[PDB]
C-alpha cells in the first residue's frame, strides 16, 4: 500500500529523492526546482523523441 514508495501519487517527485509510485514523468524546470510527477511519458507525441 504505497508502503514501498510515496503517497504523493503525483506532483513533487525526485528520481534521486522522493520516489514516484505512479507517474514516472518527473521533470523539473530550467532551474531544477519545479520537479513534478506527470503521467505522460517522455514521448511528447507518439514516438519522435
CATH of the domain at 42: 4.10.40.10
Domain that holds residue 6: 1-49
Residues ending a continuous segment of the chain before a break (C–N > 2.5 Å): none
Separation in Å, CA 21 to CA 25, 27, 45, 46, 47: 11, 15, 23, 23, 24
Picking from 8, 18, 10, the residue whose alpha carbon sits closest to that of residue 40 is 10
Q: Tell me how the structure was determined.
A: NMR
User: Could you give the number of structural domains in the chain?
Assistant: 1
Separation in Å, CA 8 to CA 17, 26, 30, 43, 45: 13, 12, 23, 23, 26
Q: Which three cell numbers stand for residue 16?
A: 534521486
Q: Which three cell numbers stand for residue 41?
A: 511519458
Spatial CB neighbours of 9, under 8 Å, sequence gap ≥ 6: 21, 22, 23, 37
Amino acid at each position: 500500500g504505497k508502503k514501498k514508495c510515496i503517497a504523493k501519487d503525483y506532483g513533487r517527485c525526485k528520481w534521486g529523492g522522493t520516489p514516484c509510485c505512479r507517474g514516472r514523468g518527473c521533470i523539473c524546470s530550467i532551474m531544477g526546482t519545479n520537479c513534478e510527477c506527470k503521467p505522460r511519458l517522455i514521448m511528447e507525441g507518439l514516438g519522435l523523441a
